[PDB]
Design a binder for this molecule. Sequence first.
Ligand SMILES: Cc1cc2nc3c(=O)[nH]c(=O)nc-3n(C[C@H](O)[C@H](O)[C@H](O)COP(=O)(O)O)c2cc1C
Lengths: 79, 239, 145, 48
Amino acid sequence: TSKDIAVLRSKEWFQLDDEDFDLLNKTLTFETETEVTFKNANIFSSVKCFGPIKVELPTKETVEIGIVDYEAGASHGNP
Amino acid sequence: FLFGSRVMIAKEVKTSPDAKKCIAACTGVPDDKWEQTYKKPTGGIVTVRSEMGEPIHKIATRGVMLWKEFDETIFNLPKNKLVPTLEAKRDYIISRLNADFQKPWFATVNGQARDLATMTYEEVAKRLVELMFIRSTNSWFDVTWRTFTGDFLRRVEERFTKSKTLSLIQSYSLLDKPDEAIEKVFNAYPAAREQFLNAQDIDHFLSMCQNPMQKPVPFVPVLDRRFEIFFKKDSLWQS
Amino acid sequence: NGNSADAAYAQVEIQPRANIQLDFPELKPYKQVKQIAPAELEGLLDLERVIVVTGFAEVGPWGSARTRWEMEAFGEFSLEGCVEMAWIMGFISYHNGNLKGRPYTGWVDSKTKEPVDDKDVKAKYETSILEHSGIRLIEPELFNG
Amino acid sequence: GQKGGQAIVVHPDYLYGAITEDRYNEYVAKVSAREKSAYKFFHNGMIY
Ligand SMILES: Cc1cc2nc3c(=O)[nH]c(=O)nc-3n(C[C@H](O)[C@H](O)[C@H](O)COP(=O)(O)O)c2cc1C
């Protein structure tokens, strides 16, 4: 659909090298790594979530398009 | 050796000044004249059956003497003969409970006695506060009691209202200043300042007075086949 | 943030509850009435010889006088009349004590005993009632065959 | 059978003007109590 690429572009950690890209009938892969500093067993104190965002080609040979960069504090989970 | 009752007068303990004062003013009695407690105050002290009938040594206060009286009249007495003799002695036993006992009759007003259904939601709450709340601390002795009160006001508003709306009590913490938490309601449904209760709003009150996981009430709501329980339960901390 | 803190924002919303009434008249002060009528009426009537009504009731195909009024003037029920006209058709009942072990204290079915609130009543019964209330096609079992 | 009939009616409030204030407001309270005691019965009975 096209209402999904918007909620995506609605995002702040879903940034790319070029928003121009076409995001329909495309398949994306998210090889993300998370770092976190706690202050309790559940209540985080700092959260990093980075990692590339890759796309299927007609060959399905994934390729890099954009980057995730989520930063946060006092979280209770990972969005 | 050990010393149980020699200690309760100490300062480190939580008993109240006047309680220590009385338990001091009571003179003991030697073993020779020991077992007279089954009948009389032996030095300002008596034995009393439990809800299990088992005996208990206790100071000779007006309230526990009243306990003694009911124990040789009411619970000694069996199931069927219980309700009716209560129907009879009501006017007297509640006068007592309100004069010389720690869990009084709920349904009383400015000293004027009555029953539950003779009592308005407004009086209900103004007494719930009068007991479950402390003007000194301006706090609630507990919260199952404050919780009780809030769950009461909730269906109050369920009743007098017409269609759905938002509770004027969204968190029971609003009760921490009660006398306003009521007018906040009894100005929303002034009818209750006048109306008595529906009984459907009595059986509830009671099923709640019998709530496990909650602290029993510091009063008596009713007379029924369970008077003893409502009478002699959690009857220790008060001192 | 967790709904831990946002749960409180799931506000508590009270369903209403049926508080039937007796429809007693209203009593206005002596002013509104000693005025509406002539002041010459005072001391002018032997009341012993004046008659009055003091109570009344009724039974019909619209139950009592409290509810018929509704279908008489308003054309449709309140809930105060949708339960009363359900307590007297054997649709619902009461129960205090315990069921499921849990203490229910309120209205309930009478064929299932499955608890109910006086809100899910109208949507649940208002139909059959009106299919079984008022003028109708005669129902034999009220007339033994 | 031709035993026809015609009753009529008046509004009560055309009554209390026949009497004195103190007696009215005295009547008043003596009723309010009733409504309540009646409210009670109606419901204790309606349930059980
Ligand atoms: C206030 C109080 C509470 C007691 N609670 C218990 C109890 O919970 N379990 C128990 O086995 N004995 C209990 N006892 C009995 C004491 O262990 C002890 O036998 C008693 O205090 C001795 O009485 P004395 O001070 O006259 O020597 C209690 C006694 C008192 C005075």
